[PDB]
C-alpha cells in the first residue's frame, strides 16, 4: 500500500552490498573457483534482499522458495550487468575481478558476450539505478510464477501480480517523473521488460554451462528463527 | 509508418494457417515423430508470415535468418498455447491431435505442463487475437536482437527497436480502445511482455529436451526469387 517513490525508497535502501573476490592480490593470478565462491557468498545476502522486496514476506515459505530457486541466477546476472555498465568490453564480477572477454575462454565466452551484450544494451538506454532495483524485483516476482503446484496457491498468485503491477506503477512514475511523454514512457518500459526475456535466456544458458543452491538450503536460509 | 490500426490489420491478414496433423484416422492410435512432422511443415508458413511483418523484410537476409533462428521454437509455442487457450488442460497441437498431461509420459510432461499453464495464463487474461499477433511479432524481433555479431549492424538494430517501438504503440492503442484505463494499460502491456519471458523459458527448455532447422535451411526459404 506504499506510494512510488517509497516503493523507489524502500528499494534502494534494500540493495544488497557488493562483494570482492577473495584470491591474495599478492600471490600470482583457478576461475570458476572465484565465480562459485562470489556466487555463494552472494547468496546470502540475496536472501535478506528477497525479504524487504515489499509483499514478499507475504507469501508463504514455500513459494517463497521457489521463487527464489527460479530467479537466483537472473538476479545474480542482472547485478553483475548493472555492474558492469560504466566499464564496456568488462565483466565487474567484483571490484577485484574486472574480466574481458578472453579472459572467459569450454563454453563460457558465448554467456560472457550475452552478458556484455545486455550490458552495453542498458548502457545506451542510460538504465537508472530506480529502474534497475524494479527490474530485479520483476525478475524475483515473476521467473518462478508460473511453475506453481489450491485457494491459498490462488490468493498467493494474485498477490504476486498486484505486486507486480505496483512495481509497473513505479516503473511509470520515474519515467513521468523525469518529464518522458505518455508514449515514451509505454515504449521504455516495454524496452526494459523485453531485456528480461534475455536474462531468463542468459540464466537457463547459465544453468546448463553450470551442469546450484538446493531447495532445502534455500528453505534453511529463508525459514528463520 | 502505418497507423495502429492498419498495423494490427496487416498482422491478422498475415496469420498462418492452422495445419493437420498427417496420421490416419482409421488406423489406431509414434507421438514425437507426429510432433516433428507438424513443426517441419508450419516453420514454411512461418516464414511466409514472418515476411509480412511490417519491417522484417527491410533486414539483411542474413538478420532475417538470425531472427528466426532465435525465435522460431517460441513462435512455434506461443501459437500452440493460443490454440490451446480453450481447452483447459489440453493442447491443441491441431484440429486432430488435441492431447492431455497424460497422453505427455522422458521430460515431455515438464513442458506440457508449462505450455498448459502459459495457455491459462492467457485465459485468464482473456488474451484477444489482436494482442496475440502482436506479441508473437514481438517475438521474431526480441529474441535474436541481442546476439548478433558494422554500421550496418547499428542501422538494423535502431530499425528493429523502432519496430519493436510501434508494436508497443500498436499493443497501448488495442487497450485504450477497449476502454483501459491508462494505468490499466500500462499494467497489460507488462503483464503481456513479462509472459514473453516465460516462453523463452520454455522454448530453452524445449531446445534441451531437443537435444532443429539449420541456419542454411532456414536462409534457403529465406533466400527467394
Ligand atoms: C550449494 C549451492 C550451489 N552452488 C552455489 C553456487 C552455485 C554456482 O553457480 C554459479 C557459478 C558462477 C557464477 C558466475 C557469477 C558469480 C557472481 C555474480 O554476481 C554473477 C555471476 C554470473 C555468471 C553466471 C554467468 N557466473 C559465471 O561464472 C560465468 C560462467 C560462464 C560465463 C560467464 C560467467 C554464478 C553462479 C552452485
Ligand atoms: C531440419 C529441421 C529440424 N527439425 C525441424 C523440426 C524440428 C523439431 O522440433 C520440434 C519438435 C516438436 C515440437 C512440438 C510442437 C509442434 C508443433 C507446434 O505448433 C508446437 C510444438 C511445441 C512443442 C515444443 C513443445 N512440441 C513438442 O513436441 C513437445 C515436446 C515436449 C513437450 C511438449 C511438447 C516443436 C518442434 C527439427
Not at 544488497?16 to 556466487?39: K, V
Not at 548502457?123 to 530485479?136: A, D, H, P, T
Request: proline share 4%; aromatic share 6%; glycine share 4%.
Amino acid at each position: 500500500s506504499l506510494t512510488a517513490d517509497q516503493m523507489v525508497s524502500a528499494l534502494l535502501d534494500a540493495e544488497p552490498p557488493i562483494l570482492y573476490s577473495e584470491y591474495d592480490p599478492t600471490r600470482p593470478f583457478s576461475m570458476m573457483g572465484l565465480l562459485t565462491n562470489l556466487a555463494d557468498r552472494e547468496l546470502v545476502h540475496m536472501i535478506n534482499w528477497a525479504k524487504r522486496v515489499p509483499g514478499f514476506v507475504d507469501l508463504t515459505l514455500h513459494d517463497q522458495v521457489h521463487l527464489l530457486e527460479s530467479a537466483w541466477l537472473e538476479i545474480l546476472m542482472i547485478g553483475l550487468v548493472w555492474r558492469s555498465m560504466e566499464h564496456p568490453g568488462k565483466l565487474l564480477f567484483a571490484p577485484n575481478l574486472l574480466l574481458d572477454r578472453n579472459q572467459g575462454k569450454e563454453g563460457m565466452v558465448e554467456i560472457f558476450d550475452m552478458l556484455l551484450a545486455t550490458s552495453s544494451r542498458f548502457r545506451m538506454m542510460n538504465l537508472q539505478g530506480e529502474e534497475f532495483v524494479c527490474l530485479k524485483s520483476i525478475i524475483l516476482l515473476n521467473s518462478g510464477v508460473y511453475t506453481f503446484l489450491t485457494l491459498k496457491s490462488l490468493e498467493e498468485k494474485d498477490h504476486i501480480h498486484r505486486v507486480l503491477d505496483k512495481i509497473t506503477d513505479t516503473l511509470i512514475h520515474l519515467m513521468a517523473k523525469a518529464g518522458l511523454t505518455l508514449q515514451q514512457q509505454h515504449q521504455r518500459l516495454a524496452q526494459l521488460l523485453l531485456i528480461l526475456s534475455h536474462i531468463r535466456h542468459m540464466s537457463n544458458k547459465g544453468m546448463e554451462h553450470l551442469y546450484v543452491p538446493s531447495y532445502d538450503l534455500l528453505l534453511e536460509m529463508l525459514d528463520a528463527h
